[PDB]
Amino acid sequence: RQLKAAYSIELAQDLRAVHGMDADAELSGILATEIMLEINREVVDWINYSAQ
Amino acid sequence: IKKQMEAGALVEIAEGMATSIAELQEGFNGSTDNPWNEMGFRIDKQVIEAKS
């Protein structure tokens, strides 16, 4: 599995200046959590896919 | 041209790029035909013989 995301430099400056969010950890936090969510859902999905 | 400049018809001007273009420069987000502006340098020599 794989994902990716890109952000402009000006947006990173703009987001930090007006909101205090670094615009880089958020995308890292979003992508890392999303992959774990899909995998966690998948394993449960296979269990029901295989249950007698 | 200088005579026009004195008369006030034409005046010097200096602006800056709107941030929208400053992100979409030669690439990012699918934009095309917008290369950067670059600078370089050249080195040239001179040679001096000796008289007597």
Report how far apart, in Å, the C-alpha atoms of A24 and of each of A3, A16, A48, B5, B45 are.
15, 10, 37, 50, 48
Structure tokens at B44: 């040239």
Amino acid sitting at position A29: G
Contact check, Cβ <8 Å, B23/A9: yes
Q: What residues form DSSP beta bridges with B27?
A: B31
Tokens 């007698």: give the residue: A52
Q: How far is B21 from chain A (nearest CA, A)?
A: 11
Tokens of A10: 């000006």
Closest CA to A21 of A30, B22, B23, A34: A30
Q: Which pairs count as long-range contacts for B36-44, CB under 8 Å and 24+ apart, including other chains?
A: none
Contact A10 B22 (CB under 8 A): yes
Question: Å resolution of this model?
Answer: 3.9
For residues B23-52, one letter each, b for 16 or more C-beta atoms within 10 angstroms of the residue's C-beta and e for the rest, the string is beeeeeeeeeeeeeeeeeeeeeeeeeeeee
Q: Where do we find the tokens 């703009």? A: A14
A6, B28: Cβ pair inside 8 Å? yes
Method used to solve the structure: cryo-EM
Q: Is A40 helix (H, G, I), strand (E, B) or coil?
A: helix
